[PDB]
Design a protein around this ligand. Structure first.
Ligand SMILES: O=C(Nc1ccc(CN2C(=O)c3ccccc3C2=O)cc1)[C@H]1C[C@@H]1c1cccnc1
Ligand SMILES: O=C(Nc1ccc(CN2C(=O)c3ccccc3C2=O)cc1)[C@H]1C[C@@H]1c1cccnc1
Lengths: 467, 462
């Protein structure tokens, strides 16, 4: 990795495009206004540690970038002078300052999340150079926000159907690994799901948390053994009971997820699980239940189908709220077609049918880690303040064509008003400190991470509240 | 990176789930049929080299995995012995064979693209373990296909409005670096666009290509200097003419892109470009022209407004096909909201208002590299064949699917592509298998250069 080759190409030429005596370029990030009314600020620390901290510039990288740009542009348009200056004066450390709201904070749309500026007047071009790498925090932010929004649905419906929040943290399992664009995307997205939940299959998220954030607990995410069509079918139709028995006996002390639709769902439930192997299931611990995956079809219909047939063979009870509840050794997982919308439908549909949410857990692949863009929360990075010839300019973009909410102006700060509202103060109005302390803190300054947060602090900052 | 930590958690437990005496698990990858009739096969060589070749299993990697799984599953369900067996018997090299169609090959939907299987029967479980990393090839495949589909639209309109395809490889530029989820995605994504085009701002794609593919050319992709709002909005309302002037003069030997809707699209074009700096515009090389980025709003409407505005101030002259051409020192780039659908609208709209496509180039970000899923081309990975107790069984998941047995890929005399199921390929009626061993027991048996891939992925009309 070489930071000198980690930017949009056109930004390499920017050191030649500014008015002379430009000493300061100040830029900020927000999730612009105009269902996701608030965002979970997560992911910056990862970027800061992995790509920006310490000696990121060397003689080798300078010459490597010089050679690539020469061919790529078919012209000498690379700042060897400016980059050699960072190497000589700062030992390749970036003379930049990043200030940001604490990770895991829940912030309404249209508020500053983080700001960037150069610290040395000579490195005015550096602010826009690192824009590309920083804007990429749109992804862990979007992943964390959507994952938190799904947790709200689950919390509301588990409280409405049971009066408790039992296993809430395990009700949305991450299955996204194979559905994402890369190994790095997987790790980042999985770490972002884990901000709100404790169940993943994207092992990549565990090593990411341990390396860049840390938890007091031995792991940030958990999983259970599971049996798919590929393993069941290798046994053959006449050995489905033998398959089921082998799997459940191997995983006696922990929960086990087993597919029911390989041959015949009704027979797997009613006859195999409900008759032949019933002695092995009824014996199971509340901590180690058998989890059944439904047949393919409508996510609500298949869930409803499974619940009803299991209820014909196993003792179903009415909880404190009057909702149908399966025995503790038996649970259901819906891992087909789950996104923020279908989740709301399955849980509403279950309530209507007097079935508790205590019974069900969900799985999400592409709809949790891939079918997401910078467009969802309107993640924007704009320059708001420039110092040319000692003269400060409150820069912005207010186009008449797309009005939107438009770019903010000048130096920025985030505050929580006495009334508990988040406010972003423009044109340096925050320097008045009328609205309390600035919520943004210096996380990065001149090649050093100055402020860090453990994943536990993040989790705690991201907590659901009974307001 | 630790391959023992790069699978879906549930797959870790699979060695405890197959019937006794399971000797072979053979799986394949396909873009199942359902707009996108033909797919570009690209990206596996990268996965092979970065994650699968050489000593991938080590005693340290086994120990790290055992410790992570113990906590992750709250029990001991990790195959310590089975991984130790690969460490000792194979020097930590994976006993697997991947047979794939050549990179860059354009294959119709519903065909075998690549197959995976274990070479050692003790390692039957391995085919499932590596599914996760291998299916991730959906992404470079999808980017390369969607980018090539756009290349077909731009070829159709460049032909009808101009009679030739000069500059086709520069009509769709990559702006995707910001819009993607990670540095890794950016490089993979950008490298997949570079199969069909030569214009990129996602520098990470170049380095990937160099390391994993290679070119005869020094760089696989190219770009031009460009002026964003931030660099313009910094000079103040008063010196846009001095900003424009500073940029155009600094970048004289190369084309120059200027986003001209910072203050006024009409005035910057009519007064600034049109007259005040017209001497530094008409003087410019055809190989180094000025490129104007349209104003905000509807991408077609704004492209047309700019073209009409530039008309009433510059020499607009009809070409051989009778399409409105701009002078060769003046060009336009539409970089906002461009995707496969909007591109069609724009090029058709331009043809309708009698504007040649030589006038324009396009830039795509999120739409090119990020707004794409495994469902777009029904990218499917399935186990088709399993050998249990010496008995070869054909498996297909049929809920409320798959091809059967050992698969092969052939081109018929008529030129059709056919996937031969259940080992039928042995007979050799329809020629030779297009699937070549690209990986065996820890080594990349066959590699492709980027030049070859581009040759293979060429348009039929080129
Ligand atoms: O279904 C699977 N796993 C599974 C099932 C269910 C769960 C959710 N759960 C818990 O954690 C838990 C803890 C204690 C009691 C009850 C539960 C409870 O119900 C968590 C994980 C894997 C096959 C599917 C998969 C994975 C990746 C890609 N494709 C498909
Ligand atoms: O617009 C930009 N560059 C640019 C301009 C124009 C072009 C298109 N073209 C060429 O390359 C070229 C070569 C030789 C002759 C003629 C041309 C010719 O017409 C290609 C690229 C960047 C600002 C926008 C951007 C970049 C990254 C992320 N967001 C936005």
């Amino acid at each position: 990795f070489n930071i000198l080759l980690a930017t949009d190409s056109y930004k390499v030429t920017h050191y030649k495009q500014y008015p002379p005596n430009t000493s300061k370029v100040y830029s900020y990030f927000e999730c612009r206004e105009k269902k996701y009314e608030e965002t979970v600020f997560y992911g910056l620390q990862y970027i800061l540690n992995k790509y920006l901290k310490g000696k990121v510039v060397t003689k080798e990288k300078i010459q490597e970038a010089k050679d690539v740009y020469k061919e790529h542009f078919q012209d000498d348009v690379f700042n060897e002078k400016g980059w050699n200056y960072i190497l000589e004066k700062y030992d390749g450390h970036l003379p930049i300052e990043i200030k940001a709201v604490p990770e895991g904070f829940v912030i309404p749309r249209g508020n500053v999340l983080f700001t960037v500026e150069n610290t040395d007047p000579e490195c005015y071009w550096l602010t826009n150079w690192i824009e590309t790498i920083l804007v990429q925090s749109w992804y862990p932010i979007t992943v964390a926000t959507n994952s938190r929004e799904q947790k709200k649905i689950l919390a509301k419906y588990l409280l409405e159907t049971s009066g408790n929040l039992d296993g809430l943290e395990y009700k949305l399992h991450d299955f996204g690994y194979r559905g994402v664009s890369s190994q790095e995307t997987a790790g980042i997205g999985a770490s972002a799901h884990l901000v709100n939940f404790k169940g993943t299959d994207t092992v990549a998220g565990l090593a990411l948390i341990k390396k860049y954030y840390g938890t007091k607990d031995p792991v940030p995410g958990y999983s259970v053994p599971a049996a798919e069509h590929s393993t069941i079918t290798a046994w053959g139709k006449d050995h489905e009971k033998d398959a089921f028995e082998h799997i459940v006996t191997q995983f006696s002390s922990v929960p086990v997820s087993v597919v029911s639709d390989s041959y015949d769902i009704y027979n797997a439930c009613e006859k195999i699980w409900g008759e032949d192997l019933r002695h092995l299931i009824v014996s199971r611990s509340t901590q180690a239940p058998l989890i059944i995956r439904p047949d393919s079809g409508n996510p609500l219909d298949t869930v409803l189908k499974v619940l009803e047939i299991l209820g014909k063979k196993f003792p179903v009870t009415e909880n404190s709220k009057g909702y149908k509840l399966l025995p503790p050794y038996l649970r259901v997982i819906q891992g087909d077609g789950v996104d923020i919308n279908t989740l709301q439908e399955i849980v509403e549909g279950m309530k209507q049918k007097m079935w508790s949410i205590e019974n069900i857990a969900f799985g999400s692949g592409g709809g949790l880690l891939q079918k997401l863009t910078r467009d969802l929360l309107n993640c924007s990075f704009k320059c708001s303040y420039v110092v040319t010839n000692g003269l400060g300019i409150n820069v912005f973009k207010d186009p008449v064509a797309d009005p939107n909410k438009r770019s903010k102006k000048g130096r920025l700060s985030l505050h929580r008003t006495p009334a508990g509202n988040f406010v972003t103060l423009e044109e340096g109005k925050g320097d008045l400190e009328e609205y309390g302390q600035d919520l943004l803190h210096t996380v990065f300054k001149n090649g050093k991470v100055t402020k860090s947060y453990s994943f536990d602090e993040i989790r705690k900052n991201a907590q659901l509240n009974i307001e």
